[PDB]
Subunit: 325 residues, 4 copies
């Protein structure tokens, strides 16, 4: 998985979900008056409206990622190994891993408020059910000011790190992942000057040599570096349509194609979907691996004062424009 | 630019066109009875039908790439530096660089026949006009048997190389480009065994480490390696729609996003379009940078006995499916 | 800097010292009855004999690295950034950074005993003097059983990590440095099988392609990977002379040549000396950058019951064998 | 193998010889009046004096490399695959592969003269004997002006290329090897500015990050890049002793340690010797893998008017300075 905030125009947040099987994901709008229950905290009877990619069990929106009406975005990304959840702790705001995205998107109007909400929190080892055990995750939170943080619960406890690049992938822990970027300081979009052998003619035989050492692997560190470079050098678009076009090109740079990331015999981790939302306008856009046409769900076309989840199925059939006849 | 033959199903051939400006490209069908004039060879009054991406000047189809009705595909890719064209030579079949794609697609029913057509050929330094000077190019030819060759005219003369990987990008010359793949023999989709320090626990902290050293740069060598890996490990799809979906994912792996390959101030080489055709059925598919929906032009829905070029404009507006209302 | 334990024969421990200036280093033997004073712990009036590379101030052996008569080796390596020393703490064994190598080598007969000695320790922010301020360091301890640990005092406190590779360089912190080795699992001394494009002839045009992705940079991460590979694949020598020959070849693989690691204008970090000792026999061997002949100081040829430091100057003139006359 | 000219002081030329077995190499001086026989050219009864590393069969100096009294150096390096020798050709100066180094060093007073001597030459497929078949080689020639060329006989014929970097290793052919350096234009001794994410703090956590992408592998391309960087950034020494010290540090950067380059089970290509000569003074220096002390053979201490080969055995026992007693 790879999640980014693209800081152009209204600003755009979302993620690639990389996995070897589909999950039953659908587009879910949680309206302001849908009651959100929590295992160790008060229920939220009224809260911010949410739109995102989710599964639904027992009428609960188990979000993979989403954005709320106040311009806050959040995504949960696989974190298998470092992730550690703790027993319920007296005097701490105890949040199950499956509750964290619904809770923050319901309650926080900014990254700054999300930090306050997490300042006395504990990610508790609470399973949704016997069928759905807690999965190892970490999270990125971003908002329409451009701010973002990385939330990791590990053996050390709960850490909320400023995220200066607005990117997150999988392992390792965030300080290690961020430090690795320093190894790539010399990589650039423009052709490098010859500092290797300055008094020797070393012909520039190809365009693009500025990115000769840019990683293109399927692994988590490679994708973190390549996605950071791609988002940091993305254009400033003119329109909203240009900006969402540019956004998906960022995510596409670290898409995992089928066949390239083998996790078991005949089994490959690939980008099952890519989504991104306009943070100011609450428009959710997504593509699936099987359909290249972008789909848009505008949360404000719905009844955000409703009290039941509103859902749409992901359009996963390739829609080809038959241009001639 | 990157061109590939994807050897699944009916087999699929095409290219990314990477450039810093649009060219006026359109989809062009050359029917069997469109007369094709040649500067130093007999006119072809009747020939195979062609579909591809082209510009048109003086009613001549200046193809960037295309396929013909017999399942032969061909693409011209920038080759600035090594490319050399020669004066017209007595006793040689003299072909202008701008004529080579129209000529081979009109006259050859296989890569094998294309080899015979080139066995006494000379790529002549003939300009289309004073406005359109000859550009430095090399070419890949592929067919529905899976065969392919790389055609390069350099200071050494005209070389036609067997292409064992069915891929071509830009510089350097093909033997050098092919040899470079040997440096990547150890890169694989599956997780590598620990041969680095076999008696030490080196945890597999991420999926995808098989491709940790896979290049992700924008330059010609990086894209050649990454595209070869991606096509060599692409799935065998079930349907025609799955196969064209898989095909564009191959090309997408080496797409050049805006902002990453700077060629002059504020000027970036990016993938202006991607196309790919079913070699058996003569269906041409394409995307533009600005539109993620795939477009299809079926050559057999046209009058292939016509005598005038048939053209369609590239659909370059992002077509977003507005899912809710 | 790079420190290694070479697990062949009697076993051999030492380090490259990489710096941009000389330090006044000399070879120092601390005999059993040289009193070693400590700022916050009892003096050691009798202890194990030590030999190593050191400077001497106020008749105190400020060791960079050394080994003791019981087969324990220890080295202090620059750790600028992560290193943090704490105020003196009640109820903790408080050890100044400049005391740690003299103390462990004087008091510990094994890595296991060194772990016990550090189990309630605090690396205190105590300067040797106003002229010699505390420098940021971390340490490797190894012994003749092959065991080794990495000692780091950071903002987290004092950590003593099992060191499964018997190597240490500079930044970053040890868990991050060790995790990075997992990225190199596929690198090997033998030629790799073609898993990149298995059905394509990719000729093995050079020997040594197993190490094509082995780092050769001057930076701390590059040297950690290359030194680990080189020591892990070093031969098992026949004699003691062959083993010390093999040992220096390990250190030489990550030597920093003058001109390659620029730290300020005209200023280069280079390997000012390399040393290594037979852990069982207490023989200290060293080379300087300016002299390629190995020099040996056998600690047991000295009076190890003495009470004063015994010193030898480093032989830093190139001794060339004039073979003909 | 790796051969370099180090352009400091009097200038210094030589090579690492990398192989999996010893060859019986000795130091050989060919005096001016030693008759040199040639299979297809006139004998040289009088010629320039030569010193170098060689084997001797039938009183013929089969040089691996050497320098002559006029400041010309030459080395033969393995070139298995591209190397092609031709039948004896009428009207060409036909030179056996085993004769080329003795011939050029005997007859040429500069690289420019060596070019003239090769302008009508053919490297003929002539074996020294049935026991010593012709081995595949290419060659570097350098002189005390700093000039150098690369000599390759391949399927294309005989090519003599200007060598702008004064380095040669093994495969591939020289234009490909030289072009590969352009991929490393951004590698430098100084710390790189942050062009990757310019508005983000990417801490410089280690010195030496300028060379983070510098290759450290055992293969021919890796060693070519690393040796070129190391020689191009070597210091300008003060004395002759400093210069020969600096020279061996250049060769040491691409030494192949035992255990790292496996060519068959239990069989490793390693640097059996390293040599380098003062081009102006005709002093030959060498080390063996087993002996770190530099050895010097001054050709002018010999009778250069003699008519028989003068030989010295390589000092291959480690000479350790026993500093204490």
């Amino acid at each position: 998985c790879t999640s980014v905030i693209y800081t152009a125009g209204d600003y755009y947040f979302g993620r690639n979900l990389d996995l070897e099987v589909n999950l039953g994901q659908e587009v879910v709008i949680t309206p302001r008056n849908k009651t959100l229950e929590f295992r160790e905290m008060p229920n939220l009877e009224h809260h911010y409206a949410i739109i995102g990619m989710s599964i639904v069990r027992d009428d609960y929106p188990l979000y993979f990622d989403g954005v709320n009406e106040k311009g806050v975005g959040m995504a949960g990304l696989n974190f298998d190994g470092p992730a550690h959840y703790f027993p319920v702790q007296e005097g701490k705001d105890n949040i199950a891993s499956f509750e964290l995205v619904p809770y923050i998107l319901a309650a926080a109007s900014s990254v700054a408020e999300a930090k306050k909400l997490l300042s006395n929190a504990n990610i508790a080892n609470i399973n949704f059910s016997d069928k759905l055990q807690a999965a190892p995750l970490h999270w990125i939170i971003a908002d329409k000011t451009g701010a973002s943080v990385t939330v990791e619960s590990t053996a050390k406890g709960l850490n909320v790190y400023d995220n200066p690049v607005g990117v997150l992938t999988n392992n390792p822990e965030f300080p290690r992942q961020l430090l690795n970027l320093s190894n790539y300081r010399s990589v650039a979009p423009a052709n490098p000057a010859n500092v290797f052998a300055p008094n020797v003619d070393l012909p520039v035989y190809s365009r693009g040599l500025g990115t000769h050492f840019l990683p293109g692997g399927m692994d988590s560190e490679s994708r973190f570096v390549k996605a950071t470079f791609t988002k940091m050098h993305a254009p400033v678009g003119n329109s909203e349509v240009e900006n969402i076009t540019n956004y998906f090109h960022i995510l596409q740079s670290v898409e995992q194609q089928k066949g390239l990331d083998e996790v078991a015999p005949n089994t490959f981790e690939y980008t099952i979907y890519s989504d991104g939302s306009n943070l100011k306008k609450g428009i959710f856009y997504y593509k699936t691996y099987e359909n290249s046409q972008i789909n848009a769900v505008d949360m404000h076309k719905e009844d955000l004062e409703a009290s039941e989840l509103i859902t749409y199925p992901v359009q996963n059939k390739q829609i080809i424009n038959q241009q001639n006849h």
